[PDB]
Design an enzyme around this catalytic site. Structure first.
Site, short mmCIF file in Angstrom:
data_model
loop_
_atom_site.label_atom_id
_atom_site.label_comp_id
_atom_site.label_asym_id
_atom_site.label_seq_id
_atom_site.Cartn_x
_atom_site.Cartn_y
_atom_site.Cartn_z
N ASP A 37 8.80 2.03 -11.76
CA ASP A 37 9.38 2.50 -10.52
C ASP A 37 10.84 2.88 -10.76
O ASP A 37 11.47 2.44 -11.72
CB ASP A 37 9.23 1.47 -9.40
CG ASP A 37 9.35 2.10 -8.01
OD1 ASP A 37 9.44 3.35 -7.91
OD2 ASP A 37 9.34 1.32 -7.02
N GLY A 58 13.62 2.59 -8.72
CA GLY A 58 14.66 1.94 -7.94
C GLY A 58 14.72 2.38 -6.49
O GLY A 58 15.44 1.77 -5.71
N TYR A 108 12.77 2.01 -3.94
CA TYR A 108 12.49 0.99 -2.93
C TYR A 108 13.69 0.08 -2.72
O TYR A 108 14.01 -0.29 -1.58
CB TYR A 108 11.29 0.16 -3.35
CG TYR A 108 10.84 -0.85 -2.34
CD1 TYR A 108 9.92 -0.51 -1.35
CD2 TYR A 108 11.26 -2.16 -2.40
CE1 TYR A 108 9.46 -1.44 -0.43
CE2 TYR A 108 10.82 -3.10 -1.47
CZ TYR A 108 9.91 -2.74 -0.51
OH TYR A 108 9.47 -3.68 0.40
N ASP A 160 13.64 8.31 -5.43
CA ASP A 160 13.45 8.59 -4.01
C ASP A 160 14.20 7.56 -3.18
O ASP A 160 14.81 6.63 -3.69
CB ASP A 160 11.95 8.53 -3.65
CG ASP A 160 11.34 7.14 -3.83
OD1 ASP A 160 11.74 6.42 -4.78
OD2 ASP A 160 10.42 6.80 -3.04
N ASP A 175 -0.25 -0.72 -6.93
CA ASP A 175 0.50 -1.86 -7.45
C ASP A 175 0.83 -2.79 -6.30
O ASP A 175 1.03 -2.33 -5.17
CB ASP A 175 1.86 -1.47 -8.09
CG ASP A 175 2.94 -1.19 -7.06
OD1 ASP A 175 2.98 -0.08 -6.47
OD2 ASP A 175 3.76 -2.09 -6.81
N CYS A 206 -16.87 -15.27 -10.15
CA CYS A 206 -15.84 -14.73 -11.02
C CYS A 206 -16.10 -15.08 -12.47
O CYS A 206 -16.43 -16.22 -12.81
CB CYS A 206 -14.49 -15.32 -10.60
SG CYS A 206 -13.11 -14.75 -11.58
N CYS A 220 -13.78 -14.89 -14.88
CA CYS A 220 -12.55 -15.11 -15.62
C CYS A 220 -12.56 -16.46 -16.34
O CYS A 220 -13.36 -17.36 -16.04
CB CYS A 220 -11.33 -14.99 -14.70
SG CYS A 220 -10.75 -16.49 -13.86
N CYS A 280 -12.18 -19.66 -14.15
CA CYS A 280 -13.39 -20.08 -13.44
C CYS A 280 -14.46 -20.58 -14.38
O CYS A 280 -15.35 -21.31 -13.94
CB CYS A 280 -13.88 -18.94 -12.54
SG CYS A 280 -12.72 -18.61 -11.18
N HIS A 335 -6.51 -15.95 -12.69
CA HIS A 335 -7.67 -15.73 -11.84
C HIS A 335 -7.43 -14.59 -10.85
O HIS A 335 -8.30 -13.74 -10.66
CB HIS A 335 -8.05 -17.00 -11.08
CG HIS A 335 -8.99 -16.70 -9.97
ND1 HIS A 335 -10.34 -16.47 -10.17
CD2 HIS A 335 -8.75 -16.43 -8.66
CE1 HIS A 335 -10.89 -16.13 -9.01
NE2 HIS A 335 -9.94 -16.10 -8.09
C1 LIG Z 1 5.31 -3.64 -1.08
N1 LIG Z 1 5.17 -2.28 -0.51
C2 LIG Z 1 5.82 -1.22 -1.09
N2 LIG Z 1 6.24 -1.20 -2.34
C3 LIG Z 1 6.84 0.04 -2.51
C4 LIG Z 1 7.50 0.57 -3.63
C5 LIG Z 1 7.51 -0.18 -4.96
C6 LIG Z 1 8.49 -1.30 -5.02
C7 LIG Z 1 8.57 -1.90 -6.42
O1 LIG Z 1 9.69 -2.84 -6.36
C8 LIG Z 1 9.33 -4.17 -6.76
O2 LIG Z 1 8.95 -4.88 -5.57
C9 LIG Z 1 10.04 -5.15 -4.64
C10 LIG Z 1 8.05 -3.92 -7.56
O3 LIG Z 1 8.44 -3.46 -8.86
C11 LIG Z 1 7.36 -2.77 -6.81
O4 LIG Z 1 6.49 -2.08 -7.69
C12 LIG Z 1 8.07 1.86 -3.48
N3 LIG Z 1 8.76 2.47 -4.53
C13 LIG Z 1 9.31 3.63 -4.35
N4 LIG Z 1 10.00 4.19 -5.35
N5 LIG Z 1 9.27 4.33 -3.18
C14 LIG Z 1 8.58 3.85 -2.11
O5 LIG Z 1 8.54 4.57 -1.10
C15 LIG Z 1 7.97 2.55 -2.23
C16 LIG Z 1 7.30 2.00 -1.14
C17 LIG Z 1 6.77 0.74 -1.31
N6 LIG Z 1 6.09 -0.07 -0.43
ZN LIG Z 2 -11.71 -16.61 -11.77
#
Ligand SMILES: CNc1nc2c(CC[C@H]3O[C@@H](OC)[C@H](O)[C@@H]3O)c3nc(N)[nH]c(=O)c3cc2[nH]1
Ligand SMILES: [Zn+2]
Ligand SMILES: CNc1nc2c(CC[C@H]3O[C@@H](OC)[C@H](O)[C@@H]3O)c3nc(N)[nH]c(=O)c3cc2[nH]1
Ligand SMILES: [Cl-]
Ligand SMILES: [Cl-]
Ligand SMILES: [Zn+2]
Lengths: 371, 371
Positions: A93, A95, A97, A144, A268, A306, A308, A311, A337
């Site tokens: 990702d 950054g 978020y 983004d 994810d 399961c 795994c 289990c 698990h």
């Molecule tokens: C939980 N819901 C959610 N996650 C999101 C993430 C991943 C956060 C990433 O940040 C970290 O979690 C806080 C982890 O690495 C995660 O993959 C997003 N990333 C981006 N760039 N843009 C988004 O619009 C976005 C929206 C999300 N909604």
């Molecule tokens: Zn299991």
């Protein structure tokens, strides 16, 4: 040898698809679930255990690794794959978020975002893409802004428009670095909050730029499943059909099933890892909290079907004891698990689409999971 | 099939011995190091990983398991081996160390000791042996008092005399339970603080009762290596030569080497597990603290010769990052390496005694470890 990037769709049922993404470091079976490893580790698992659950790709994060241990440091040490001992594809990702979730620490402008702990660290389309290069990411996410929820139409439009300008800058930064352009892939991120017209404008802008895959951003931020599904209903068809569709941050098992029914190929979520360490185990009959006293003498495995290793070897009673005692092995076993459960869900999804019986699988899954 | 208990000495050099203990659940190579698992887990390791390091036997504790999850509960669930998934021999301590370390919580009498959290739990020779039966322990320890250090000669004598009365009660309780007497072994524990005359009286009392093995108790309680070795010099020869000699609570690598030179066959210590989680890694060139900034870009393994899986796969720099970040995988990797180091030490000890070159091994070990 494998191509830089090839997505092939092998079978379809309604809006659902199953297939493969081929990349230099391996094949990703879709629909795919990506375990999250923000600190260069999937918490409480060796990489070989992650692989034993069936994961084909894991997720890292530009933001966390920039702070600790540092992007330049990881590059000097040979890249993220070598550093953590995972040799298959990694999606990072951007950054974007954290631009939203950590906004109180930030100063934002058209040029990027500076985060203040008291140390300062800057992200921008150019710097985010550069960090992902230094990490050696296989799937690079555009930089983004994840629009906060709820958002007014005006603020959702302003945010989305900035993200689309940032998507073009991300594309150009990625393409200007020959080694990255030749060996990694770049995904764009659709924004627009819950508004169909803004989602359409965002999809059109991203398709005009052109990306290897398209994420649905800005969801799983408090809107709830009904609203998330309503937005997916119109948003996923706007994206190019022949490229992967990645729903960021989703989710609970039923969220995944319904999102696949709406055309999503990649997911994810921290839920299986984080909630596992907190004592929640996923089962075909719904989640259980292993800390509950009712499990103290329960000799059955976490889940009765399961496959795994947890289990096969340990009881609910033992894992209950470990979690109550705060023992590290409890976190290890719960996590293995839960990730295995998620991968078995994805396998059942893939097989049912391949066999033209996914709609029946979804109905059967929901009847039992929510009984 | 294997006997209940057979100790055979295959080779000797000075006071050092190497050989095997055969028991129903497996063979124990001596000198042996027992990883500690007080909460029915060797912290941060699956049993299969413990076995991969070379451990033949692990240690549990009557006191901790009585409190959580409960002795009767473990019996109802099929015993400690099944509960935790370790099918080889388990030695259980009797609670006699906690009689001393937790004495402020206790009321002691000739009949036993009651511990107060506000819940109360009682131990006695009879109840300790019974708990160890309920756990399904293979090597049962007599219920003793670990005399505090320092102790006056008068108090050391009074304590030792009570422990010898308690040793006879332990013997009789064990023998009165046919299934336990036929399938497990019982070790007596020598006391007497640092005083040769009291150590002799204790050895004589234990040999008169008769046990399958003899522990040196009351050491590794703050006396320091010089004094511990001085006491071992006269104490170990007092014990029957043809039975195993177990030094409780020892210790650092050099403590183990010197104790073997003085006739000890078995060891337990939390140092490799606990100090591993705290960032201390054992190497042939002495311990290192992986948290130190000097390791942040060090691509070498924890130890340059170690054959463990951690040293085959991960760098000091990665483990430094994990421990600094508080990541569970850091505890897992440090612990596996340290237990593997301890087992490799024991293997080198056994091989060198078998080949008549243990005195040279001890000298070489010390020259390099303390360089
Ligand atoms: C939980 N819901 C959610 N996650 C999101 C993430 C991943 C956060 C990433 O940040 C970290 O979690 C806080 C982890 O690495 C995660 O993959 C997003 N990333 C981006 N760039 N843009 C988004 O619009 C976005 C929206 C999300 N909604
Ligand atoms: Zn299991
Ligand atoms: C550290 N030095 C040391 N340990 C010792 C232990 C094991 C503690 C046991 O208690 C727990 O550790 C606090 C672990 O399970 C450990 O095996 C002892 N146990 C008994 N019964 N009698 C002793 O005289 C004694 C002396 C010790 N000196
Ligand atoms: Cl997590
Ligand atoms: Cl420990
Ligand atoms: Zn090692």
């Amino acid at each position: 040898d494998r191509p830089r990037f090839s997505f092939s769709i092998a079978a379809r049922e309604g809006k659902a698809r199953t297939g493969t993404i081929e990349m230099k470091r391996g094949v990703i079976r879709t629909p795919a679930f990506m375990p999250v490893g923000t600190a260069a580790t999937v918490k409480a698992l060796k990489p070989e255990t992650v692989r034993a659950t069936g994961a084909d790709i894991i997720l890292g994060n530009t933001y966390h690794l920039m702070l600790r241990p540092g992007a330049e440091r990881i590059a000097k040490l040979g890249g993220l794959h070598s550093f953590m001992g995972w040799d298959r594809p990694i999606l990072t990702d951007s950054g974007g978020y954290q631009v939203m979730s950590l906004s109180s620490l930030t100063k934002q402008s058209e040029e990027g975002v500076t985060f203040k702990s008291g140390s300062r660290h800057m992200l921008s389309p150019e710097r985010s893409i550069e960090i992902q290069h230094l990490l050696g990411s296989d799937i690079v996410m555009a930089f983004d802004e994840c629009t906060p929820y709820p958002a007014t139409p005006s603020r959702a439009a302003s945010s989305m428009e900035r993200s689309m300008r940032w998507a073009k800058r991300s594309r150009d930064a990625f393409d200007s670095r020959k080694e990255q352009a030749e060996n990694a892939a770049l995904f764009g991120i659709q924004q627009g909050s819950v508004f169909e017209n803004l989602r359409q404008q965002s999809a059109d802008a991203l398709a005009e730029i052109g990306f290897d895959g398209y994420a649905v951003g800005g969801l799983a931020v408090g809107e709830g499943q009904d609203e998330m599904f309503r937005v997916l209903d119109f948003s996923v068809p706007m994206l190019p059909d022949d490229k992967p569709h990645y729903l960021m941050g989703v989710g609970k098992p039923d969220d995944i099933v319904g999102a696949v029914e709406r055309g999503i190929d990649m997911f994810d979520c921290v839920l299986p890892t984080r909630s596992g360490r907190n004592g929640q185990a996923f089962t075909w009959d719904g989640p259980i909290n292993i800390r509950n006293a009712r499990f103290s003498e329960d000799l059955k495995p976490l889940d009765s079907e399961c496959h795994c290793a947890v289990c096969q070897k340990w009881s609910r009673a033992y894992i209950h004891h470990l979690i109550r005692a705060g023992e590290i092995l409890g976190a290890m076993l719960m996590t293995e698990h839960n990730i295995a459960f998620y991968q078995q869900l994805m396998q059942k999804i893939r097989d049912s689409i391949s066999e033209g019986r996914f709609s029946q699988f979804a109905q059967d899954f929901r009847a039992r999971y929510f009984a």
